[PDB]
Write a protein that binds this ligand. Structure first.
Ligand code: DGD
Ligand code: CLA
Ligand code: CLA
Ligand code: PHO
Ligand code: PL9
Ligand code: LMG
Ligand code: SQD
Ligand code: LHG
Ligand code: LHG
Ligand code: LHG
Ligand code: BCR
Ligand code: OEX
Ligand code: CA
Ligand code: CL
Ligand code: FE2
Ligand code: MG
Lengths: 39, 34, 334, 65, 38, 81, 342, 30, 34, 37, 38, 34, 37, 30
C-alpha cells in the first residue's frame, strides 16, 4: 500500500525532477539561442 | 597524583618516534652531495 | 670614539644577530625577569589565595597541575590594585601565598612587550623601512593590556586579571561572559569578525598565491625551490590569481593591486582585534553587551523568551557558581 | 622486463591501456543507473529516517521478535 | 627586604637612563639615508 | 570588462530612476502591507502578541510527537479559544 | 563533436559579470534558497512551537536575537521535508515545526559543495592550481561537523546550532557548560589555527606594506603598483633581515610563506572539526581523572580546572530547564547550585 | 613523573628555539 | 550598444526585489504594538 | 638485479626539521596532559 | 538611456540617506512596540 | 603480575634509542655519494 | 665562517646496522625481565 | 604488558634475522 509518507516521497521526487528538468530545459534553450562566436 | 601510568610512555613515544623520523630524514639529506 | 659613543653604536647596530636598540635595553631585562619568574612559578609555585578568602588555588606543576590546568595565579583580592613587589612582603612565603609572581610577571611582561613594539619601530627606522609593522603589533599588545591591566583597573583588583594559564584563561572568559555578556557586545563581535576574517583571508591569500606559482620545478621536487631568496621577479602570476578570484565572485570584488590587497590583509584583523581589545577595555568599566532579557512580551504581558534569554540562563549559571565563597551580599557590583 | 608463466598468462588483461569507446559511448545509460541509484539511496535513507514509512516496515529494534 | 628593593631601584634606574640618554644620543641621524635632521 | 553595461552608467541614467522610483517604493510598500495586514502571521504561523498563550496558561506549547506534530500544533492553536 | 552538451558548456562558461559554470546549476539555487530561507525565517517565522522562543523581527526580535531555530527534539533527525509525514505539505505547519532549519542546513550544505566545485571549475578554466578549493575544504569540514554530524550524534536536530547570532552564542555557552569544549585539545588547535591565521594575515600585510620599494613619487604609495609588472613590489631581503633581527627567525622563501598561510587556519579548523565530531558522541575532554581523585580526597586542593567545572555545573543547572523544554525539567530553588549570596 | 615529562618537553622546545634561531640555515641571495 | 537583461541582471534582481520588500515589512513591524 | 629507475632521493632541509620538531614537541606539550589524564 | 545623466554623487548621496533612514527606523523600533521590553 | 610499572618504558627506550641512533647513521651513510 | 678542516664523514654499513640491532634487541630481551622484575 | 614486550622484542629479532639474511649487503669480490 501507498502510505501518506510514500505519497510524500513521490511528491518530493516529482518536485525535484520538475525543478531540475525545467532548469536544464531553460539553460539548454538559452545556450542554444545565445551561442558563442568562434573562429 | 593518580595519573594514568601509561601516560609517560605514551608521551615519550609520541615525542620520540616522529622526531626521530625527521632527524633521520634531515641527516641523510645533509650527507647528500652539494 | 669614546666609550659611550661605542656603546651607542653597538646598541643601535644593524649588524647584531638580534637587534638590541634603546627599546631593547629596557625590553631584554624585563622580558628575561618575566620569563624566568613565570617558568619557575609555573613549575614550582605554591597555591595562591587569588580571591583573598584564604582559599588557595594550586597553579604549579609540582603542586598537582598538568600543562592544561596549570597557571600562575593572580594576586590576592585583598591586595586589590596595590603595588605588591617582593619587598612589600614580610617574606617570600608570604609573597607566594598572596600571588606576587603574577604582579611581577605581568608588569615586566607589559613593559617588555611595549618595548618590543617600540623596538619594531626602531629596527624599521634603522633599516630604512616604512614604520608601521609595530602598529599592527599594537593590536595584540593592546589586547594583553586589556586583560592584564585595564580590566583589573576597572574592576579594582589584579585578582581579576586573566590568569597566566590555559584553564585559568577559560575561567576568565566564562566569568567575563557571566558579568558582561561579552558575546552580545558588538566590539567582541567585531573581534570575532576580525579573527575569523583574518583566518579566512590568510587561507584565501595563501591559496591564491600558491595557486598561481609559476612553474619553475619538476614534479619530483618541492615547488618552493622554484623561488630563490631575493630574486627580483615575482614568483607567482597575480594577473592569473586575479583572473581566477574575479571569476569566483565577480571582477570588481577581486584585488588586482597587490599593495591594496596586502593593506587590506594588514588592516582587517588589526582593526578587528583593536575592537576586541576595546571591547575588553570598555567592559572593564562595565559598559556591557546588549541586554534583551524579556525584550519580547505578548499582549497580556507574558514574557516570550528569545535566544537572548537562554543565553541569559547560561550566564546566570556562571554568575551564581563562580567564586562560590567570595560573595556575602546579593549583587556582584565589581 | 621479466616474463613469467603467470605473467604470460595474464598479459592480455593488461594490454589495452588507453583504449576507449568512441565519443560519449554508454554515458547516457550510466547516467540512468546513477539516477536510479540516487533514488534508491534516497529511499533507504528516508526509510531509516522515518520520513518514508511503509506498511510492514517497522524501523525499530522491535521489527519482529 | 629593603636590600632587594634598593637593588631593583638601582637596576631599573640604570636601564631607564640607558633608554633616555640613548634616545637623546642623536637617534634621528641613525638611519641609512638622510642623516642631517638637526 | 565583461560586456554588460557599467553599473555607474545605469544608475546615473534618467531611465533607470524613472523605472525604479516606481518599482522600489512599490516593493517597499508591498512588504509593509505584507506585515500591516497581518498576512505574514498567517503565512508563517507566527503568533501575534495575543496568541502565544491562552489567557491563564503559562506552559509552552512545545511539540512532543514527531509524526502527530501537525495535529499537536493545530490543537495548541484551538486551545487559544 | 558539437552536440547540445558542448553548446550548453559554451554558454555556461561564458565570461560574464557573474560566472556560472556547471557548478552554478548546483550552487546558485541552493545558496539562494539557503540565504533566502534564513532571511525569511529571521524576518517572519517563530520558534514558539519548537523552542518556546520568539525568533523573528515580526515578533520583535532584533538582528542579534533573531534566528531560524532547530526543530523540536521530538522531531529527532527528520529531514523535515515539506512533503514529509510531519508537515504533510502544509507550509505554515512546516514553518511552525522548524522545517526551515533543515531547509537551510541541507541547501547550505549542497551550496557549499557547489561553491567548492565552482572553485575547481574556475581554477581549471583559468589554468591555476586548485589550492583555493583545497583551502575551502576547512569551512566545509566545520559546517558538516557542527551542523550535521554533531546533531546526528545527539538526540535530534534540536541540539544543532540554530541559525542566529544570539542562538550561536547560546551554542558556545552550551558547549562550555556541557562539553567543557575549551578543555578539548582539538578545540585548542582550532583556536591556535584561527588566531595564528589572523596573526599571519596581519603580520604579513604589515610587513609587505612597510618594505615597499619606492616605485612612484606619490606619498600615497598604492598608485605606484602595476598588476603586470615583473618586479616584486616589496623587499623580501629587507623584510627577512628585519624579522631575523627582531624575532630571531624570518621567512626567506615566499612560496613557503604563502603555503604556510594556507596551512595554519585550514589545519586549525580541521582539528576543531575532529573535536566536534567527538562531541557528537559526548566523547568530551571534560575531566582529568587524577585531578578529580585528588580533589575528591582533598577538599583543600583547588585549581582553575575545578573552578571551571563549578562554572559548568552552574551553566547546566540554570540553563537546562528553559534550554531543553522537552525534558520538562523542574529544578526546585533548593537544588540549584549557588555560591554564597549570589 | 608527570611534572618531569611536562618540564622536559618544554625544555626541549626552548632548546629548539635556540637552534632554530642561532643555528638556522642562513638565507642566501642567489 | 549594451544588452539589458543579462545573467547579471537576473542575479542582481533576485537579491534586490526580495530585500526591498523585506526591508519594507521590517519597517512595517517597527510600529507593531503588543 | 637490474636497478629500479623509479628511485628518487629524499630530502628534508634544516628549516623543515626545525618546523617538524616544533610541531611534534608542541603537540606533545598539548596532548601529554590528556595522556596522563 | 544616456549613462551619466544623473550625477553619481547625487545617486550615492540619496541612496546613502535612504539607508540611514531605514536603519534609523529599525533603531527607533528597538525602543517601541515589540522587542522594546515594554 | 605485580611487575615494575616502569619496566615497559625502560625496555622500550632501551631498544628504541640506540636502534634509532644506528638507523640514523646507516641511512645517512647510504645517501652519501657512490 | 671559514670551514673546519678537521671534519670527517661518518659511516655505518648495512652489516654494522644489522650487528648493532642484533646486539641491542638481544640485550633488551635479556635485561627486560630484570627491568620488569 | 610484560608479555607483549617480550614477544615484541622476540618478533623484532626474528624480523631482523630475515633482513640480515635476505637483505644483507652482498659480498663482492674486488
Ligand atoms: C564529506 C563532506 C561532503 C559534503 C556533505 C554532503 C551533505 C549530504 C546530505 C546527507 C544527509 C544525511 C542525513 C542523515 C539523517 C539521519 O541520519 O537520521 C538518523 C537516522 C536514524 O534516525 C534516528 O534513529 C534513532 C534510533 O531509533 C531506533 O532506536 C529507538 C530506540 O531503541 C527505536 O527502537 C526506534 O524505533 C529505532 O528506529 C532515534 O529514533 C532518532 O530519533 C532517529 O533520528 O539514520 C538514518 O537515517 C540513516 C543512518 C545510516 C546511514 C548514515 C549515513 C549519513 C550519516 C553519517 C553520520 C553518522 C552520525 C554519527 C555521529 C558521529
Ligand atoms: C539543484 C538545485 C536544488 C537541489 C540540489 C535541491 C535539494 C533539496 N531540496 Mg530543493 N529546491 C530547489 C533546488 C534544489 N533543491 C529549487 C529551485 C526550489 C524552488 C522550487 C526548491 C524548493 C525546495 C523545497 C520547497 C524543498 C526542497 C527540499 C529539498 C531537499 C530534498 C529534495 C528531494 O527530496 O528530491 C527528490 C527528487 C530528486 C532527487 C530528483 C530525482 C531525479 C531522478 C534522477 C529522475 C527520476 C524521476 C522520475 C522521472 C519520476 C517517476 C516517478 C514515478 C514512478 C511516479 C533537498 C535538500 C526540501 C527540503 O529541503 O526540506 C527540508 C523541501 O521542502 N527544495
Ligand atoms: C580564542 C578564542 C576562540 C577562538 C579563536 C575560537 C575559534 C574557533 N571556535 Mg570557538 N569557542 C570559544 C573560543 C574560541 N573559539 C569559546 C570560549 C567557546 C565556548 C566553549 C567556544 C565554543 C565553540 C564552539 C561550540 C564551536 C567553536 C568553533 C570554533 C571554530 C570556528 C571556525 C569557523 O569559523 O566556523 C564558521 C563556520 C564555517 C567555517 C562553516 C562554513 C561557513 C560558510 C562558508 C558560510 C557562507 C556564508 C554565505 C556567503 C552567506 C552569508 C549570509 C549573511 C547574511 C550571514 C574555530 C576553530 C566551532 C568548531 O569548532 O567547529 C568545528 C564550533 O562549533 N567554538
Ligand atoms: C563565520 C565564519 C566564516 C564565514 C561567514 C565565511 C564566509 C565565507 N567564506 C568564503 C570563502 C572562504 N573561506 C575560506 C576559509 C575560511 N573561512 C573561514 C570563516 C568563515 N568564512 C575560516 C575561519 C577560514 C580558514 C580556514 C576559504 C579558503 C574561502 C573561499 O575560497 C571563499 C571565498 O571566496 O572567500 C571570499 C565565502 C564562501 C561564499 C559562498 O559559499 O557563497 C555561496 C553561498 C552559500 C553556499 C550558502 C551557504 C549557506 C550556509 C552554509 C548556511 C546558511 C547560513 C545562513 C544563510 C546565515 C546564518 C547566519 C547566522 C548563523 C548568524 C564566504 C564569504
Ligand atoms: C535550480 C535553479 C533554477 C538553477 C539555475 C542556475 C542558473 C544557471 C543560474 C543563473 C542565474 C543566477 C546568477 C541567479 C543568482 C541567484 C542568487 C543571486 C544566488 C546567490 C548565491 C549566494 C548566496 C551569493 C552570496 C554573495 C557572495 C557569495 C558573498 C561572498 C563574497 C565576499 C563578500 C567577497 C568580498 C570580500 C573581499 C574583501 C575578499 C578579498 C580578500 C581576500 C580574497 C584576499 C586574497 C586575494 C585576493 C585577490 O583578488 C588576489 C589577486 C590575491 C592574490 C589574493 O591573495
Ligand atoms: C538593494 C541591496 C540588495 C542586496 C541585499 C543582499 C541580501 C543579503 C542581505 C543580508 C543582510 C542581513 C542583515 C539584516 C538586518 C535587518 O534587517 O535587521 C532588522 C532589524 C529590525 O529591528 C527590530 O524589528 C522588530 C520589529 O518587530 C523590533 O522592533 C525590534 O526591537 C527591532 O530591533 O533592525 C535592527 O536589528 C537594527 C540593526 C540592523 C543592521 C544589521 C547589522 C549589520 C551586520 C551585518 C553583517 C553581515 C554582512 C552583511 C553585508 C551586506
Ligand atoms: C552613509 C554613511 C555616511 C558616510 C560616513 C563616512 C564614514 C567613514 C568611512 C571610512 C572611510 C574609509 C576610507 C578607506 C580608504 C583606504 O583604505 O585607502 C587605501 C586603499 C586604497 O584603495 C586603492 O586605491 C588606489 C588609488 S588611491 O590610493 O586611492 O589613489 C588604487 O590603486 C587601488 O587599486 C585601490 O584598491 O584601500 C584598499 O587598499 C582597499 C580597501 C580596503 C578596506 C580598507 C578598510 C580597512 C579594513 C576594514 C576595517 C575592519 C572592520 C571590520 C572588523 C573586522
Ligand atoms: C559585498 C561585496 C563587496 C565587494 C566590493 C564591491 C565592488 C565595488 C567596485 O569595485 O566598483 C563598483 C563596480 C563598478 O562597476 P562598473 O560600474 O564599472 O560596471 C561593471 C561592468 O562594466 C562590468 O562589465 O560595480 C560593482 O561590481 C558593485 C555591484 C555589485 C554587483 C552585485 C551582483 C549580484 C550577483 C551576486 C554575486 C554572486 C557571487 C558568485 C559566487 C557565489
Ligand atoms: C583614515 C582612517 C583610519 C582608520 C584607522 C586605521 C585603519 C587602517 C590601519 C590598520 C593598521 C594595519 C598595519 C599597518 C599597515 C600599513 O602600513 O598601511 C600602509 C598603507 C599605505 O601606506 P601609504 O604610505 O601609502 O599611505 C599612508 C600615508 O603615508 C599617507 O598616504 O597605509 C594606509 O593605507 C592608510 C589609509 C587610511 C585610510 C584607511 C581607512 C580604513 C579604516 C576605516 C575604519 C572602518 C572601521 C569600522 C568598523 C565597523
Ligand atoms: C604508527 C607508526 C607512526 C610512525 C610515523 C611517524 C610520524 C611522522 C610525522 C611527520 C610530521 C613531520 C612534519 C614535517 C614538518 C615540515 O617539514 O614542514 C616544512 C615543509 C616544507 O616542505 P617543502 O615543500 O618546502 O620541502 C622541504 C623538504 O626538505 C621536506 O622534506 O612543509 C610540510 O612538511 C607540510 C606541513 C607543514 C607543517 C607546518 C607546521 C609547523 C608550525 C609550528 C607548529 C607547532 C607550533 C604551534 C604554536 C601554536
Ligand atoms: C524559503 C522559501 C523558499 C525560497 C524563498 C526565498 C528564496 C526568499 C528570498 C528573499 C531574500 C533574498 C530576503 C530579502 C533580504 C535582506 C534584508 C531582510 C533586507 C536588508 C539591509 C540591510 C538592513 C543592510 C543594512 C546594514 C548592513 C548589513 C550593511 C551596511 C550597513 C547597514 C547598517 C546599512 C521557497 C519559496 C522556494 C519555498 C519554501 C520557503
Ligand atoms: O574576584 Mn574574580 O569575579 Ca570580578 O565580579 Mn565580583 O570580583 Mn570576583 O565576583 Mn564576579
Ligand atoms: Ca495592547
Ligand atoms: Cl570561578
Ligand atoms: Fe603575499
Ligand atoms: Mg518595536
Amino acid at each position: 500500500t501507498i502510505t501518506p509518507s510514500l505519497k510524500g516521497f513521490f511528491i518530493g521526487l516529482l518536485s525535484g525532477a520538475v525543478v531540475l528538468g525545467l532548469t536544464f530545459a531553460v539553460l539548454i534553450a538559452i545556450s542554444q539561442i545565445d551561442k558563442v562566436q568562434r573562429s | 597524583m593518580e595519573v594514568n601510568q601509561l601516560g609517560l610512555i605514551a608521551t615519550a613515544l609520541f615525542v620520540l618516534v616522529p622526531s626521530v623520523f625527521l632527524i633521520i630524514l634531515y641527516v641523510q639529506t645533509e650527507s647528500q652531495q652539494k | 670614539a669614546n666609550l659611550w659613543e661605542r656603546f651607542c653604536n653597538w646598541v643601535t647596530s644593524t649588524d647584531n644577530r638580534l637587534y638590541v636598540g634603546w627599546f631593547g635595553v629596557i625590553m631584554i631585562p624585563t622580558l628575561l625577569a618575566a620569563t624566568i619568574c613565570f617558568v619557575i612559578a609555573f613549575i614550582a609555585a605554591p597555591p595562591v589565595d587569588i580571591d583573598g578568602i584564604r582559599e588557595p588555588v594550586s597553579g604549579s606543576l609540582l603542586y598537582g597541575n598538568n600543562i592544561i590546568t596549570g597557571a600562575v595565579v593572580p594576586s590576592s583580592n585583598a591586595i586589590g590594585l596595590h603595588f605588591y613587589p617582593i619587598w612589600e612582603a614580610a617574606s617570600l612565603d608570604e609573597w607566594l601565598y598572596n600571588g606576587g609572581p603574577y604582579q611581577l610577571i605581568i608588569f615586566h611582561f607589559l613593559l617588555g612587550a611595549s618595548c618590543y613594539m617600540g623596538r619594531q619601530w626602531e629596527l624599521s627606522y634603522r633599516l630604512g623601512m616604512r614604520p608601521w609593522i609595530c602598529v599592527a603589533y599594537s593590536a595584540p599588545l593592546a589586547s594583553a593590556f586589556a586583560v592584564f591591566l585595564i580590566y583589573p583597573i576597572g574592576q579594582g583588583s589584579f585578582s581579576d586579571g586573566m590568569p597566566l594559564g590555559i584553564s585559568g584563561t577559560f575561567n576568565f572568559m566564562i566569568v567575563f561572559q557571566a558579568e558582561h555578556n561579552i558575546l552580545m557586545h558588538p566590539f567582541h563581535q567585531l573581534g570575532v569578525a576580525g579573527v575569523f576574517g583574518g583566518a579566512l583571508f590568510c587561507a584565501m591569500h595563501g591559496s591564491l598565491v600558491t595557486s598561481s606559482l609559476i612553474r619553475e620545478t619538476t614534479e619530483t621536487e618541492s615547488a618552493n625551490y622554484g623561488y630563490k631568496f631575493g630574486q627580483e621577479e615575482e614568483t607567482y602570476n597575480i594577473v592569473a590569481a586575479h583572473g581566477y578570484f574575479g571569476r569566483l565572485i565577480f571582477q570588481y570584488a577581486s584585488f588586482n593591486n597587490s599593495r591594496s590587497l596586502h593593506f587590506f590583509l594588514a588592516a582587517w584583523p588589526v582593526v578587528g582585534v583593536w575592537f576586541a581589545a576595546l571591547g575588553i577595555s570598555t567592559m572593564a568599566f562595565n559598559l556591557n553587551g546588549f541586554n534583551f532579557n524579556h525584550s519580547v512580551i505578548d499582549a497580556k504581558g507574558n514574557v516570550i523568551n528569545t535566544w537572548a534569554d537562554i543565553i541569559n540562563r547560561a550566564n546566570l549559571g556562571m554568575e551564581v557558581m563562580h567564586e562560590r565563597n567570595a560573595h556575602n551580599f546579593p549583587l556582584d557590583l565589581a | 622486463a621479466r616474463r613469467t608463466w603467470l605473467g604470460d598468462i595474464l598479459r592480455p588483461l593488461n594490454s589495452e591501456y588507453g583504449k576507449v569507446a568512441p565519443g560519449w559511448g554508454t554515458t547516457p545509460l550510466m547516467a540512468v543507473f546513477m539516477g536510479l541509484f540516487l533514488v534508491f539511496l534516497l529511499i533507504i535513507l528516508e526509510i531509516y529516517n522515518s520520513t518514508l514509512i511503509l506498511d510492514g516496515v517497522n524501523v525499530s529494534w522491535k521489527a519482529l521478535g | 627586604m629593603e636590600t632587594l628593593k634598593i637593588t631593583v631601584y638601582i637596576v631599573v634606574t640604570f636601564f631607564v637612563l640607558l633608554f633616555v640618554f640613548g634616545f637623546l644620543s642623536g637617534d634621528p641621524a641613525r638611519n641609512p639615508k638622510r642623516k642631517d635632521l638637526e | 570588462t565583461t560586456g554588460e553595461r557599467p553599473f555607474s552608467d545605469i544608475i546615473t541614467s534618467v531611465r533607470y530612476w524613472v523605472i525604479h522610483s516606481i518599482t522600489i517604493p512599490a516593493l517597499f510598500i508591498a512588504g509593509w502591507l505584507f506585515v500591516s495586514t497581518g498576512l505574514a502571521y498567517d503565512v508563517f504561523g507566527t503568533p501575534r502578541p495575543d496568541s502565544y498563550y491562552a489567557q491563564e496558561q503559562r506552559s509552552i506549547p512545545l511539540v512532543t510527537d514527531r509524526f502527530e506534530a501537525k495535529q499537536q500544533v493545530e490543537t495548541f492553536l484551538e486551545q487559544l479559544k | 563533436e558539437r552536440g547540445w552538451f558542448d553548446i550548453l558548456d559554451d554558454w555556461l562558461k561564458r565570461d560574464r559579470f557573474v560566472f556560472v559554470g556547471w557548478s552554478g546549476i548546483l550552487l546558485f539555487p541552493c545558496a539562494y534558497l539557503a540565504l533566502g530561507g534564513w532571511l525569511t525565517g529571521t524576518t517572519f517565522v517563530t520558534s514558539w512551537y519548537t523552542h518556546g522562543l520568539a525568533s523573528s523581527y515580526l515578533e520583535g526580535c532584533n538582528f542579534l536575537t533573531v534566528a531560524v531555530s532547530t526543530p523540536a527534539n521530538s522531531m529527532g533527525h527528520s529531514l523535515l521535508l515539506l512533503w514529509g509525514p510531519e508537515a504533510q505539505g502544509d507550509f505554515t505547519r512546516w514553518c511552525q515545526l522548524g522545517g526551515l532549519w533543515t531547509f537551510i542546513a541541507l541547501h547550505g550544505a549542497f551550496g557549499l559543495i557547489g561553491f567548492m566545485l565552482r572553485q575547481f571549475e574556475i581554477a581549471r578554466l583559468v589554468g591555476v592550481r586548485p589550492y583555493n578549493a583545497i583551502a575551502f575544504s576547512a569551512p566545509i569540514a566545520v559546517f558538516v561537523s557542527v551542523f550535521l554530524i554533531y546533531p546526528l550524534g545527539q538526540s535530534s536536530w534540536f541540539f544543532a546550532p540554530s541559525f542566529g547570532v544570539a542562538a550561536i552564542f547560546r551554542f558556545l555557552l552550551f558547549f562550555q557548560g556541557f562539553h567543557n569544549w575549551t578543555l578539548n585539545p582539538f578545540h585548542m588547535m582550532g583556536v591556535a589555527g584561527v588566531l595564528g591565521g589572523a596573526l599571519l594575515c596581519a603580520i604579513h600585510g604589515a610587513t609587505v606594506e612597510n618594505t615597499l620599494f619606492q616605485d612612484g613619487e606619490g606619498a600615497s604609495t598604492f598608485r605606484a603598483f602595476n598588476p603586470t609588472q615583473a618586479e616584486e613590489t616589496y623587499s623580501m631581503v629587507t623584510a627577512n633581515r628585519f624579522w631575523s633581527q627582531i624575532f630571531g627567525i624570518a621567512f626567506s622563501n615566499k612560496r613557503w610563506l604563502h603555503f604556510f598561510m594556507l596551512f595554519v587556519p585550514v589545519t586549525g579548523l580541521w582539528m576543531s572539526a575532529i573535536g566536534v565530531v567527538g562531541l557528537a558522541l559526548n566523547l568530551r575532554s571534560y575531566d582529568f581523572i587524577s585531578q578529580e581523585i585528588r580533589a575528591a580526597e582533598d577538599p583543600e586542593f583547588e585549581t582553575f580546572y575545578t573552578k571551571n567545572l563549578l562554572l559548568n555545573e552552574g551553566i547546566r543547572a540554570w540553563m537546562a530547564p528553559q534550554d531543553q523544554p522537552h525534558e520538562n525539567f523542574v529544578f526546585p530553588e533548593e537544588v540549584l547550585p549557588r555560591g554564597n549570596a549570589l | 613523573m608527570e611534572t618531569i615529562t611536562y618540564v622536559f618537553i618544554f625544555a626541549c622546545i626552548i632548546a629548539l628555539f635556540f637552534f632554530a634561531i642561532f643555528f638556522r640555515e642562513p638565507p642566501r641571495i642567489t | 550598444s549594451y544588452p539589458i537583461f543579462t545573467v547579471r541582471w537576473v542575479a542582481v534582481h533576485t537579491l534586490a526585489v526580495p530585500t526591498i520588500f523585506f526591508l519594507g515589512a521590517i519597517a512595517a513591524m517597527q510600529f507593531i504594538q503588543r | 638485479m637490474e636497478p629500479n629507475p623509479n628511485r628518487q632521493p629524499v630530502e628534508l632541509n634544516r628549516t623543515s626539521l626545525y618546523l617538524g620538531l616544533l610541531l611534534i614537541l608542541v603537540l606533545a606539550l598539548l596532548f601529554s596532559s590528556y595522556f596522563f589524564n | 538611456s544616456e549613462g551619466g545623466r544623473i550625477p553619481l554623487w547625487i545617486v550615492a548621496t540619496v541612496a546613502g540617506m535612504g539607508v540611514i533612514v531605514i536603519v534609523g527606523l529599525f533603531f527607533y523600533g528597538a525602543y517601541a512596540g515589540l522587542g522594546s521590553s515594554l
